[PDB]
Amino acid sequence: KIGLFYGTQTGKTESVAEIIRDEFGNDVVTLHDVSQAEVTDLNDYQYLIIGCPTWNIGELQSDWEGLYSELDDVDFNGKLVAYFGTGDQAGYADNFQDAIGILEEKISQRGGKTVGYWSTDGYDFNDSKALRNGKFVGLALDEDNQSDLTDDRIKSWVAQLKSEFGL
Ligand SMILES: Cc1cc2nc3c(=O)[nH]c(=O)nc-3n(C[C@H](O)[C@H](O)[C@H](O)COP(=O)(O)O)c2cc1C
């Protein structure tokens, strides 16, 4: 029912995808590491969760970068799309969560209806390509600075998405 497509450099978004899966049900969510994925794998789901950390100051994580150049080959109309990222707001206050911002911008143009928007309250940052009229395009996690907050963030966003998705 939901395909969660994640990239990871140092394992944190992956560890977070697993918590997400387990919050919905591991029956409801299928995980796909986008290092092993085909862009046409995204066609298999009408409900997508897109996980990407921002790397090297504002860049997509390297596996998502590879897939990004082909998002063009896919039709996202009729799909509902949620985004999550891991990032470091203290180290990169100017580019916090840019990657999910970049991914959503593209997937949105190609058809996908974004669900899963999230309050910027309680984050300390200057700018982000994830910002959308005062909210983040999706769940912003910081395992570097706010890891005590992650569990309850995920529980709360997942409950939100169960509603947005119709589950
Ligand atoms: C050199 C480098 C550059 C980074 N740049 C950003 C950034 O621009 N924006 C951001 O939010 N986080 C940035 N981060 C933090 C990572 O996104 C964060 O550590 C994330 O949890 C990594 O996810 P991963 O473990 O799944 O690869 C950067 C981290 C490193 C080491």
UniProtKB/Swiss-Prot annotation:
SUPFAM superfamilies: Flavoproteins (SSF52218). It comes from the Bacteria. The keyword Flavoprotein applies. InterPro entries: Flavodoxin (IPR050619), Flavodoxin/NO_synth (IPR008254), Flavodoxin_CS (IPR001226), Flavodoxin_lc (IPR010086), Flavoprotein-like_sf (IPR029039). Signal peptide: none annotated. Residues 2-162 form the Flavodoxin-like domain. Its cofactor is FMN. Keywords: Electron transport, Flavoprotein, FMN, Transport. The keyword Cell inner membrane does not apply. GO terms for molecular function: electron transfer activity; FMN binding. GO terms for biological process: electron transport chain. Belongs to the flavodoxin family. PANTHER family: FLAVODOXIN 1 (PTHR42809:SF1), FLAVODOXIN 2 (PTHR42809). Low-potential electron donor to a number of redox enzymes. This is Flavodoxin. It comes from Nostoc sp. (strain ATCC 29151 / PCC 7119). The gene is isiB.
